[PDB]
Amino acid sequence: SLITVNTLQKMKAAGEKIAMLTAYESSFAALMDDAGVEMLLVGDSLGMAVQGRKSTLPVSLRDMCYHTECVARGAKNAMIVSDLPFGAYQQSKEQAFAAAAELMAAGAHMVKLEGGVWMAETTEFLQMRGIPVCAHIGLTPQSVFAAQALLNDAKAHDDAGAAVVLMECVLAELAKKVTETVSCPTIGIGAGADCDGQVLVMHDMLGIFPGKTAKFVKNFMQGHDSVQAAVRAYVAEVKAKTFPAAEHI
Amino acid sequence: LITVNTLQKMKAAGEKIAMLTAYESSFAALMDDAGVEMLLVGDSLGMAVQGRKSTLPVSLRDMCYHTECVARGAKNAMIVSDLPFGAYQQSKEQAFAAAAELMAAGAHMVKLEGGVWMAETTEFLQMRGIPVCAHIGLTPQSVFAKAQALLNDAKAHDDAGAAVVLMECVLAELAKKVTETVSCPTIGIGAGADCDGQVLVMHDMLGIFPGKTAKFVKNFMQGHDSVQAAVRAYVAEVKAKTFPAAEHIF
Amino acid sequence: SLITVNTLQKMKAAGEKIAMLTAYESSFAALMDDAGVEMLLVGDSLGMAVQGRKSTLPVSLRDMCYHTECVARGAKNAMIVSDLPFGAYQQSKEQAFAAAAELMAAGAHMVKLEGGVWMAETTEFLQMRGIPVCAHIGLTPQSVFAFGGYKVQGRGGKAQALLNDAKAHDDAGAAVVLMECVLAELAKKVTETVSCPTIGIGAGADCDGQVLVMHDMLGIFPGKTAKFVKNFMQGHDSVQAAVRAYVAEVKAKTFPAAEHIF
Amino acid sequence: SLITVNTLQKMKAAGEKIAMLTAYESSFAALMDDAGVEMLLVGDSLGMAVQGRKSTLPVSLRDMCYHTECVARGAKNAMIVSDLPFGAYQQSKEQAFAAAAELMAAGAHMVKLEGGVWMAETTEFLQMRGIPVCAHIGLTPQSVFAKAQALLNDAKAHDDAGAAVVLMECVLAELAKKVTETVSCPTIGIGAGADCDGQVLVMHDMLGIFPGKTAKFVKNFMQGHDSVQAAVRAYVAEVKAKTFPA
Amino acid sequence: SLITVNTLQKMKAAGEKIAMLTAYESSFAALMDDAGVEMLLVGDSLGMAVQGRKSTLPVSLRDMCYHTECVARGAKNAMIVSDLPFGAYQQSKEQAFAAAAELMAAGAHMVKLEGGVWMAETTEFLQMRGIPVCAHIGLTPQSVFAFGGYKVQGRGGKAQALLNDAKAHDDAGAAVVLMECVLAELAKKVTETVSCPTIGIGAGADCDGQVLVMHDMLGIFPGKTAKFVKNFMQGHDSVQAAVRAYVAEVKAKTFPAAEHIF
Ligand SMILES: CC(C)C(=O)C(=O)O
Ligand SMILES: CC(C)C(=O)C(=O)O
Ligand SMILES: CC(C)C(=O)C(=O)O
Ligand SMILES: CC(C)C(=O)C(=O)O
Ligand code: NA
Ligand code: NA
Ligand code: NA
Ligand code: NA
DSSP: OOOOHHHHHHHHHHTOOEEEEEOOSHHHHHHHHHTTOOEEEEOTTHHHHTSOOSSSTTOOHHHHHHHHHHHHHHOSSSEEEEEOOTTSSSSOHHHHHHHHHHHHHHTOSEEEEEOSGGGHHHHHHHHHTTOOEEEEEESOGGGSOOOHHHHHHHHHHHHHTOSEEEEESOOHHHHHHHHHHOSSOEEEESSOSOSSEEEEOHHHHTTOSSSOOOTTOOOOSTTOSSHHHHHHHHHHHHHHTOSSOGGGO | OOOHHHHHHHHHHTOOEEEEEOOSHHHHHHHHHTTOOEEEEOTTHHHHTSOOSSSTTOOHHHHHHHHHHHHHHOSSSEEEEEOOTTSSSSOHHHHHHHHHHHHHHTOSEEEEEOSHHHHHHHHHHHHTTOOEEEEEESOGGGTTOOHHHHHHHHHHHHHHTOSEEEEESOOHHHHHHHHHHOSSOEEEESSOSOSSEEOOOHHHHTTOSSSOOOTTOOOSSTTOSSHHHHHHHHHHHHHHTOSSOGGGOO | OOOOHHHHHHHHHHTOOEEEEEOOSHHHHHHHHHTTOSEEEEOTTHHHHTSOOSSSTTOOHHHHHHHHHHHHTTOSSSEEEEEOOTTSSTTOHHHHHHHHHHHHHHTOSEEEEEOSGGGHHHHHHHHHTTOOEEEEEESOGGGHHHHTSOOOBOOGGGHHHHHHHHHHHHHTTOSEEEEESBOHHHHHHHHHHOSSOEEEESSOSOSSEEEEOHHHHTTOSSSOOOTTOOOSSTTOSSHHHHHHHHHHHHHTTOSSOGGGOO | OOOOHHHHHHHHHHTOOEEEEEOOSHHHHHHHHHTTOOEEEEOTTHHHHTSOOSSSTTOOHHHHHHHHHHHHHHOSSSEEEEEOOTTSSSSOHHHHHHHHHHHHHTTOSEEEEEOSGGGHHHHHHHHHTTOOEEEEEESOGGGTTOOHHHHHHHHHHHHHHTOSEEEEESOOHHHHHHHHHHOSSOEEEESSOSOSSEEEEOHHHHTTOSSSOOOTTOOOOSTTOSSHHHHHHHHHHHHHHTOSOO | OOOOHHHHHHHHHHTOOEEEEEOOSHHHHHHHHHTTOOEEEEOTTHHHHTSOOSSSTTOOHHHHHHHHHHHHHHOSSSEEEEEOOTTSSTTOHHHHHHHHHHHHHHTOSEEEEEOSGGGHHHHHHHHHTTOOEEEEEESOGGGHHHHTSOOOBSOGGGHHHHHHHHHHHHHHTOSEEEEESBOHHHHHHHHHHSSSOEEEESSOTTSSEEEEOHHHHTTOSSSOOOTTOOOSSTTOSSHHHHHHHHHHHHHHTOSSOGGGOO
16 A cells, blocks of 8 residues: 555556655645555645745755645655755755654655755765655756756766656656666656656646646646546546646657 | 673573563563563654654654663663664764763663664774664664675674674574674574574563564463563573574564 | 846846846845846945944854845845855855855845855855855955955966966856956956856956945945945935946946046 | 972872872862872762762763862862763764863863773874873773773873873783883873872772772771871872882 | 054064053053054953963853953954964864854954964964964963973974974964064074064064063062063053053063063
8 A cells, every 4th residue: 555665666667657746734645645646745846835935945944844744644655755955955965864864754755855966975875874865856946046967867866776766847858768777766847758757736736826837737627626636637647648748848 | 780791691602682672661670570681772662652653753862761761670681772763874973972872861782773884883882882782684764765785784783893783574594694603692583593682572572562463573461460471481482492483483 | 037147147248247236125125126236235245334343254144144035025136146254154165055055045046255266166065056156256355354454456476366266266167256356457357268257346347247335336434435436326316316327337338437447 | 289290290200109089079179189189080980979870971071060160169289180971072082172171161180081092093182282181091981881912002002192191990900010111101090000100099989988898909098087188198198108009 | 553464564574563462351452552552462361360260271262252342342453363262263173263253253353373283274274264363382371281381482302393383374374473481592583484473472572572461561460470571560650651661662672671581
């Protein structure tokens, strides 16, 4: 029942697409879990969607731990992934370990960190100590104010033992090559359907914000009269390989 | 008084060491009076005492508190305290600070989880007067995250000066080889009978949880009239080498 | 509309001068944004202009964070650059990162640090982790007691060292290099050599942009302004007109004039 | 007058035995000072004698600073030596320095640390920064829960690092003798024989405050006298006459 | 007017003796500044003259910052030098920097640290980051318990070690090198060898300047002062005049006299 890293490995081998959605509260976490969502991402994207800030930089380790605890009270079988917030882990591998440990004590089953080859040593340090790491490469929103290289980043984390490699806004053809090159499962957002799974910010896919949605995002609320049905459709289109479509790439 | 030297003599003589977890003073005095030689204040208290789903949320404060409670009840038995998740893996210096607090709380030895990558930490602590029990094989703090590696882990800790090597859920024949290879006494749980001693979580062996006991666990309460007799039977079986039996091994 | 690092790079390539001014409050930040200031510098110069102290050394990270938040609530399109205060970042690249992360969480889009080649590793450490860096070379006011005051840099055989400081920061990935009190001809060479945009104060008009302390250019202090500073309030009808004349003279390359250059 | 490291060096050179005793309070420290005790050791042994614990490991840095302050208000001429408590200085030489600096600020004139060769770097670090160090080798109570050439190596490494004094506990007398003869600094012993430049005893032990058999290498000096003052003076006289340890 | 490092360098080259005195309060600081004292030393000597302790070791960084602030409210032209107190800087160059930064934030224009060649790296770390350093060599009072009291330095084969200490600091960028209780002939050779000004106390008249503890030179203690100290209060009936006499004798090279030199 419970989704573990082995489960994700089996899904990658079986070619069965993984469904990930961000979650910041207990009620929505339980709803998504029950709707088939396999990975619950307590992302630092909550700085915009929950806190209403202009970027994710101000989110603190305290905020991430609080939301992790909330989500942990609602989740059952889904795996809880928590982001390491800006400033809380890039100082050193030792600082990253301390911040990751706090998230794990709050209820996370894996942590997500941003960065390329320069973060590979941090991934290894954490994974060796029992903390599953999700390496976030490509577009890394914490550096918002700031092909071979992406492949290198991917490989570096894989070699260090990252459990999952997540790619944001990447040429679909490159995401495909990456997914085939790394031993660990991959998760995409604006990276195509050749990844081992997909992720989207709940709020975006529920159409909580006015005006058009990002190009790589699909509104799943539309056509449904219940949030649970909207999420179920997401899981199904992810697995059907219908999402992302050609328009979302 | 049970000391490291006592354990060493027992290994050399083939006399099995009886270890049991303990998180409270009353149970600790009872186990001590019932012949338990090593009291393990383990982070297993996150599940048995705190009721969590894992031992990761256990803090250093929690370990020091439980160690202090056990220390008020213990007499002859050695107190072993676990370094909790996040409090010692950052560096050897951080592990020494955390272990120093546990020793200050009443521990006579500390236990830490990890393979070869933690051996340098074992050496740093042992050289500074802090006896270390290196816990290898199935390390519960890594639940969310292979025969030769285990052997490598055991050798590295032994060479680093580990006072004791504890193995959890390890193929029996592998455990026997490790035990015959390292110089320090070995303790097992789900590791077979060829270790120098055994450990079990108190509540498990007392049948506190409903349902079937884990495979490597035996209910010692059953067939006895008191907690005292259940514990004495556990100690007597470990020493008679009747526990664990074929049915409790992998 | 929003001013980003790419905007500055496009302006350097086009030869359009960048207008930077200091800002420590929300109302003045909004006034300057509306008057066309592109970069709003929350400088540690507030230790003197706001706090009334004799130098910028006593300014703390908390003071820097507070003013940054204030300015962030008034800014609109302009980029916010916040100074890393004395004592909060020179201890190590790790300490600099932590201090810079607090400023970015306070609302900064870039941080400014003082120092030559010995700070380039710090610049690299921060930029690689998403924190845009402005390297400030030449006369660095946090080292005022070591310099003994405000002297022009790059004289004689000191030119190479300044050039070396600029290069190390640029190679370390500095987004912008800021020069203060530097021989104009040297600043021109530096600007023509580094890949990143440059900003000057008392560095001549051949930098890719200019900066002035608000209070200096508004003639808030009694007496005369420094030689490299022009009083724009004087001869103008409002604070809004004074700032607009500054941005216009910077873009027309009339400020700094010959009188304001070393 | 005042007892300085120079005083101790001169005493070793002349063969005049040094009297050291533990002290954790102001009143007893002033009494011992007046009785001729030259070195007052504020030891982590207070964890057992004062606090009543089973070991000295739980003694904290705050406890050592407190007792150091108390003793410093009683002491006049004697040198105050303060122990660096378990867990407060073994993390690194930088940590030891911060802990030693707190003890010096509380009134100590020298600090004592436990450990062989692996602690010599720490000794060098502290001594180079003005903190006199007493290196404690042999039996080190802080490692209670956890050979001739090893002892000599430890003593030599500490002496080469600049230790002001080397303290030996429970060492074969003949071996203590060689160490004393080979190091440039004064040596102090406890259960180390009379061939040391000086002796130390825990005050409560030599005053017979503990119920039970007197420790083997300890002599009860309270016996035969009717004042604590006379008991201390007798210990100092026997140490000087080289009749203790017997 | 305003005393800077450049001023001290100009005086060394000119042969004009620098007058330094300790100061722990604002009133006395203003008086000395008005009497011509060029360097006001907020020394850890306040542990004995102000706090009444037996040594300067118990003085904390907080104490140093507090007195530094007091002195800064009275100082006008004089340069404020603050001592780094025992335990606050010897742990590492990084810790020395953090402590030195607090002193500078409290009002100091330079910090003073005790130590030989082993502290030179710390000297370099500080000066490069804008903190002027006065290296104190010879008899370093924070090491009094290791020293076994106060004793003359530099005789025999120890002379070369002292020279090394001074040159190591001079090479690291020390702004000033202070010598306490060193053979006069050695102090002279060191003064003629390093590039920075030198200040002495019990080091002869050939240093570039002198320093005394205020309370010692005002005769505040009972009995006699050390051999290298002179009571300037005697023969005068105002502290103003007593301080002016110190300044005059230092500049005339009449103090220290033969009787105050080793
Ligand atoms: C877009 C996803 C991967 C994310 O980083 C977040 O929600 O924080
Ligand atoms: C039983 C042993 C393996 C243990 O770690 C614990 O109780 O925490
Ligand atoms: C650009 C200059 C004037 C500066 O550093 C400041 O204002 O803080
Ligand atoms: C006498 C001078 C050099 C001093 O160190 C002090 O006052 O602290
Ligand atoms: Na994120
Ligand atoms: Na455990
Ligand atoms: Na500035
Ligand atoms: Na001083």
